[PDB]
């Protein structure tokens, strides 16, 4: 059909991820599973600017770059259930390439991920989310990104990351459950030899014998930029790192000498301008303004169809 998820334009990344998920589902041979479609719907160039305190201490002194360029991508996963598309998973990532100044070079960071719990069958839902994330790490590792970063931050009560109006009975995991969920994902990646290893931020920083705040990757919207500004306004930083360590993952995709002899990162996919999916706010607002909800299967399917018409006919 004219405005289907499958007819959204393809990318190498979307294709790679959907082939992984569908091959997984085919091996499980569950009669209730439907075809999965994965589409990158936004990609654009951005920069994160170093905030005044760090800018005063380290940028002005020529010890650290003033800003760091990255590519933002938004991708969505859809499942066919009884001939109807359901959008059930979304993710926004920041990708810092090989031209980026240290300490941000060749890193990926997950800005947001969100879901609505209607994947059929339910006994495969978590496994499918893990397959998308492991496939993302698999892909960026293939391109030459060396490290992944994840802040396990659940949304505040009443706050939706990507999808407006979640089901009333979809529980939101607490930090501890969410940490264990990312670990289970990462252990599967480790056994597939995609992830070399992973550590909490304090352990990584300790084992790498990092001297200075300038050595820590500096990402848009992350915790650590704001904690650094607070630290500069008022040794304590080191105490914050340890207390909150368990919620920040540093994921090594490529370690050893092989991590230092890499060609440049060449992303084969074009930029994809799309107003609706540049950041999270725009899609939340359109849902709010069109009275869309993702609060039941049928409402989510209706909202998915509206989302798709919009994606197809913008510009
Ligand atoms: C992260 C996410 C995709 C994981 O989904 P998931 O694979 O279904 O895993 P969850 O931990 O949410 O749920 C698994 C089980 O734990 C349960 N659970 C979740 N939160 C719970 C809570 N606070 N108390 C008790 N049980 C809970 C669920 O009900 C579910 O039960 P089931 O397996 O019997 O159906 C999803 O929780 C989500 O969309 N969260 C909101 C966005 C977010 O947290 N983003 C992460 C960082 S950007
Ligand atoms: C707050 C914020 N502002 C941005 C502007 C542009 C791009 C990204 C962000 C962004 C995030 O990524 C936040 N995110 C970080 C990872 C955990 C979940 C959550 C707390």
């Amino acid at each position: 059909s004219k405005f289907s998820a499958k007819r959204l334009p393809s990318t190498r990344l979307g294709t790679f991820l959907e082939n992984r998920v569908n091959d997984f589902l085919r091996r499980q041979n569950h009669p209730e599973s439907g075809e999965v479609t994965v589409r990158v719907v936004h990609a654009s160039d951005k920069t994160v600017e170093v905030k005044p305190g760090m800018k005063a201490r380290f940028v002005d002194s020529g010890e650290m770059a003033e800003s760091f360029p990255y590519r933002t991508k938004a991708l969505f996963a859809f499942e066919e259930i009884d001939g109807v598309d359901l959008c059930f998973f979304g993710m926004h990532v920041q990708e810092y390439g090989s031209d980026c100044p240290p300490p941000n070079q060749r890193r990926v960071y997950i800005s947001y991920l969100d879901s609505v719990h209607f994947f059929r069958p339910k006994c495969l839902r978590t496994a499918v989310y893990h397959e998308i994330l492991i496939g993302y790490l698999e892909y960026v590792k293939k391109l030459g990104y060396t490290t992944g970063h994840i802040w396990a931050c659940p949304p505040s009560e009443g706050d939706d990351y990507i999808f407006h109006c979640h089901p009333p009975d979809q529980k939101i995991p607490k930090p501890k459950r969410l940490q264990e969920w990312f670990k289970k994902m990462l252990d599967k990646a480790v056994s597939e030899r995609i992830v070399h290893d992973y550590k909490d931020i304090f352990k990584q920083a300790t084992e790498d014998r990092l001297t200075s705040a300038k050595e820590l990757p500096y990402f848009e919207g992350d915790f650590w930029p704001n904690v650094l500004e607070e630290s500069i306004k008022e040794q304590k930083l080191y105490a914050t790192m340890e207390k909150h360590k368990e919620v920040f993952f540093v994921i090594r995709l490529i370690a050893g000498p092989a991590a230092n002899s890499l060609p440049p990162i060449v992303d084969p996919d074009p930029l994809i301008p799309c107003d609706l999916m540049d950041g999270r706010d725009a899609f939340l607002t359109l849902a709010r303004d069109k009275h869309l909800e993702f609060s039941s299967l049928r409402r989510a399917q209706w909202s998915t169809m509206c989302m798709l018409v919009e994606l197809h006919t913008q510009s």
Side-chain angles (χ1 to χ4, degrees), residues 1-48 50-81 83-156 158-229 232 237-259 261-313:
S1 175
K2 217 188 323 204
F3 304 129
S4 69
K6 208 183 294 193
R7 287 179 111 271
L8 291 172
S10 291
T11 55
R12 301 293 196 83
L13 172 57
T15 297
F16 187 88
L17 296 180
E18 80 189 358
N19 291 348
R20 186 178 168 101
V21 174
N22 288 313
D23 289 343
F24 174 80
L25 288 178
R26 194 164 316 114
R27 300 190 316 258
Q28 313 312 297
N29 194 44
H30 196 291
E32 294 169 40
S33 77
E35 182 183 5
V36 168
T37 298
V38 182
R39 289 288 181 282
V40 176
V41 296
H42 174 80
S44 66
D45 295 323
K46 294 213 189 306
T47 84
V48 54
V50 171
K51 299 191 190 207
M54 290 290 290
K55 192 164 186 282
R57 178 57 198 83
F58 300 104
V59 174
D60 291 335
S61 69
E63 275 182 274
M64 191 181 207
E66 69 165 312
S67 79
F68 296 95
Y70 67 89
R71 191 163 288 191
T72 195
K73 294 180 178 193
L75 64 85
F76 290 85
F78 306 79
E79 189 190 20
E80 180 264 357
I81 299 177
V84 184
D85 289 324
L86 160 74
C87 187
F88 70 95
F89 178 85
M91 189 169 56
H92 288 268
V93 296
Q94 295 170 36
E95 302 187 332
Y96 297 81
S98 50
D99 298 329
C100 182
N104 280 25
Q105 203 165 102
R106 302 180 173 267
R107 301 176 184 280
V108 301
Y109 177 80
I110 300 181
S111 302
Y112 294 102
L113 78 71
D114 202 14
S115 64
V116 290
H117 73 172
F118 303 111
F119 191 86
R120 192 86 60 77
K122 67 195 262 197
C123 66
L124 294 176
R125 182 188 67 255
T126 296
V128 165
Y129 299 153
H130 287 183
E131 288 308 295
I132 293 161
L133 287 176
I134 295 164
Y136 178 70
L137 298 173
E138 188 184 14
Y139 185 82
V140 296
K141 177 173 175 180
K142 172 169 60 53
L143 296 191
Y145 295 86
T146 58
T147 317
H149 301 262
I150 298 182
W151 177 19
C153 190
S156 314
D159 201 47
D160 297 317
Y161 280 159
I162 295 171
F163 296 104
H164 188 236
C165 194
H166 279 51
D169 50 351
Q170 179 172 327
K171 290 187 186 66
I172 301 304
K174 289 309 209 284
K176 166 64 183 171
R177 172 177 294 283
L178 184 57
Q179 288 159 32
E180 295 310 306
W181 186 94
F182 280 119
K183 278 173 87 294
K184 171 180 156 53
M185 186 271 290
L186 293 165
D187 295 335
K188 191 165 186 298
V190 167
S191 72
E192 297 175 14
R193 312 306 307 263
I194 291 162
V195 171
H196 178 79
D197 63 7
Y198 61 89
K199 302 169 194 298
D200 69 69
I201 192 171
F202 174 84
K203 183 155 132 75
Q204 186 68 99
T206 291
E207 290 171 8
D208 291 356
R209 294 178 293 115
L210 296 192
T211 331
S212 179
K214 73 186 162 157
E215 290 160 301
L216 292 165
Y218 201 83
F219 306 123
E220 187 66 70
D222 189 48
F223 191 61
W224 294 109
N226 301 323
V227 172
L228 285 167
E229 291 303 290
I232 285 175
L237 168 59
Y238 179 100
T240 308
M241 276 195 274
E242 206 197 63
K243 187 180 166 197
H244 301 269
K245 70 188 202 178
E246 317 98 286
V247 142
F248 297 95
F249 293 84
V250 182
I251 305 152
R252 285 203 288 175
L253 301 179
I254 315 165
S261 60
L262 294 169
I265 286 163
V266 181
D267 181 344
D269 280 334
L271 301 176
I272 301 160
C274 166
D275 304 347
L276 188 52
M277 301 301 184
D278 186 2
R280 61 184 278 249
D281 310 288
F283 182 42
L284 289 161
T285 299
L286 179 127
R288 203 169 292 119
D289 295 352
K290 297 194 193 304
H291 310 297
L292 306 180
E293 295 181 27
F294 285 91
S295 53
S296 77
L297 170 61
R298 291 203 302 131
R299 289 210 72 166
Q301 287 170 320
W302 184 254
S303 300
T304 295
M305 191 224 74
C306 296
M307 176 201 187
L308 283 171
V309 175
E310 194 72 18
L311 285 173
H312 276 282
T313 61

